Amino acid sequence: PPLKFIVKKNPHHSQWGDMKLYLKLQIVKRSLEVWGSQEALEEAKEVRQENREKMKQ
DNA sequence: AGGTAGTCACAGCTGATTGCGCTGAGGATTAGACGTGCGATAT
C-alpha cells in the first residue's frame, strides 16, 4: 500500500521547511519487504559505500 | 600457415546517483535650546 506522510513545517527558521515526515514503523516494514531482510539491507549499504569509495578513488 | 577473438579510436543508450537551486530567519553596521550679533529704542 502507498505510504502516507505529514507535511510539517521545520522547527527551524521559515527558510525552507514544510518537510515530509513518514512513520518509522511503516518505513522499516517497507524496507524489509523490498530488501527481504535487515542483513540484506546492511550488505547493500556496505557495498554502496564501498562503491562510493571506489568511484572517488 | 589460417581464422578469429579481443582491443582501442570514437559514438549511442540505459540504469542509477548526488548535487545544487528554491528563499527566508538570528546577529553586526537634520530641527529645537543656546549662544551671539545687530539695529531700533528708554533715561
Swiss-Prot record:
The modification Phosphoserine is found at S37. Disulfide bonds: none annotated. ATR-dependent phosphorylation of XPA at Ser-37 is important for cell survival in response to UV damage. Ubiquitinated by HERC2 leading to degradation by the proteasome. Expressed in various cell lines and in skin fibroblasts. It comes from the Eukaryota. It is found in: Nucleus. Involved in DNA nucleotide excision repair (NER). Initiates repair by binding to damaged sites with various affinities, depending on the photoproduct and the transcriptional state of the region. Required for UV-induced CHEK1 phosphorylation and the recruitment of CEP164 to cyclobutane pyrimidine dimmers (CPD), sites of DNA damage after UV irradiation. During NER stimulates the 5'-3' helicase activity of XPD/ERCC2 and the DNA translocase activity of XPB/ERCC3. Belongs to the XPA family. Interacts with GPN1. Interacts with RPA1 and RPA2; the interaction is direct and associates XPA with the RPA complex. Interacts (via N-terminus) with CEP164 upon UV irradiation. Interacts with HERC2. During NER binds XPD/ERCC2 and XPB/ERCC3 of transcription factor IIH (TFIIH), bridging the 2 proteins. It is linked to Xeroderma pigmentosum complementation group A: An autosomal recessive pigmentary skin disorder characterized by solar hypersensitivity of the skin, high predisposition for developing cancers on areas exposed to sunlight and, in some cases, neurological abnormalities. The skin develops marked freckling and other pigmentation abnormalities. XP-A patients show the most severe skin symptoms and progressive neurological disorders. This is DNA repair protein complementing XP-A cells. It comes from Homo sapiens (Human). The gene is XPA. The chain holds residues 160 to 216 of 273 of the full protein.
